[PDB]
Amino acid sequence: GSMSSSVPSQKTYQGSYGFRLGFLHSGTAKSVTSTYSPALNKLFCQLAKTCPVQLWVDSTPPPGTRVRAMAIYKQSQHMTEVVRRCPHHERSSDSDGLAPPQHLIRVEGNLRVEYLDDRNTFRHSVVVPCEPPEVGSDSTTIHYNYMCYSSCMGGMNRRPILTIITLEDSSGNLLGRDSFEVRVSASPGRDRRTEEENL
Ligand SMILES: *C[C@@H](C)C(=O)n1cc(C=O)c2c(-c3ccc(N4CCN(C)CC4)cc3)cccc21
Ligand SMILES: [Mg+2]
Ligand SMILES: [Mg+2]
Ligand SMILES: [Zn+2]
C-alpha cells in the first residue's frame, strides 16, 4: 500500500526516567478481551475493545511530556509498508469523530488525544499528554483500541505487527521507548494459550 522510506527505531530505551510498559495479568479465559504474554512480549486483543497499557517511570518526566503509539510490521520484508486500516473498516466510518478513519490505533477516554499523519514518513501515530498516576494509583494507564483484525485483508493481511510506545518531551525529543507485538483476533485468550503451547 503506502510505502515509507524509513523505519522507526524499535530499540528499547528506558532513558533518564526509567520508562517501561506494564500490562494487566489477565489470564487466558474465554471471557478476556485482551491478554498479554510476557514470554512472547505480545498483546492479544479483540477488535475495537479497550486494551489498558500501563506507563511506568522511576522519576517524574518534565511538564508537557507526551506518549506516542505507532504500529509497524514485524517482518523485515514488510517493515517499510505503512500499517493502516483495511478498506472495509476505513470506509466503515466507525470513528469517534477524533480519529482518522485510516488509523489502526486509537486512544479512548481522552479528549486531548492528537493524531498524526507524518508528512515525510507517511506513518500514522496517536499521541496524548502523559499524566502522573491518579490519587491512590501507582501507574498511568492508557486505553488503546485496535480497529482492525490481524487477518483483515487489504490491511494487516495476517502479518504480525509491533506497537512502539515512545515517551517524548513537549518539543518532540525522545525520552524513552518500549514495544510489544500485537495480534488482534476474535479469541485472544485461546490464541495466547495456543501460541504459548508452541514454544
Ligand atoms: C507520563 C507518565 C509516564 C508519568 O508521568 N508517570 C507514570 C508513573 C508510574 O507509572 C508515575 C509516577 C509514579 C511512579 C512510581 C510509583 N511507585 C510507588 C510504589 N511502587 C511500587 C513503586 C513506585 C508511584 C508513582 C510518578 C510521577 C509520574 C508518573
Ligand atoms: Mg516489556
Ligand atoms: Mg518485497
Ligand atoms: Zn479491517
- Residue 19 CA: nearest ligand 1 atom is 3
Q: 107 and 96 in contact (C-beta within 8 Å)?
A: no
Q: Is 166 in the pocket of ligand 1 (CB under 6 A)?
A: no
The ligand placed nearest to the CA atom of residue 180 is: 2
Q: Is 139 in the pocket of ligand 1 (CB under 6 A)?
A: yes
Q: Is 191 helix (H, G, I), strand (E, B) or coil?
A: helix
The residues that bridge with 145 in the sheet, in sequence order, are 106
In Å, the largest CA–CA distance within the chain is 46
Q: Is 61 in the pocket of ligand 1 (CB under 6 A)?
A: yes
State how far the alpha carbon of 64 is from the alpha carbons of 140, 163, 188, in Å: 15, 23, 35
Question: Which cell numbers hold the place of 67?
Answer: 506518549
148 among the known binding-site residues?
Answer: yes
Q: 11 and 164 in contact (C-beta within 8 Å)?
A: no
The ligand placed nearest to the CA atom of residue 56 is: 1
- Give the domain extent around 157: 1-199
Phi-psi category of 173—alpha, beta or left, where left has phi over 0 and alpha has psi -120 to 50? Answer: beta
Q: Is 55 in the pocket of ligand 1 (CB under 6 A)?
A: yes
When divided into structural domains, the chain yields a total of: 1
Question: How far from chain centre, in Å, is Cα 62?
Answer: 23
Q: Is 196 helix (H, G, I), strand (E, B) or coil?
A: helix
- Phi and psi at residue 191, to the nearest 5°: -65, -40
Q: What is the resolution of this structure in A?
A: 2.0
Q: 81 and 5 in contact (C-beta within 8 Å)?
A: no
Q: 189 and 79 in contact (C-beta within 8 Å)?
A: no
Closest CA relative to residue 68, chosen from 169, 165, 145: 165
CA–CA distance, 53 with 55 (Å, rounded to integer): 7
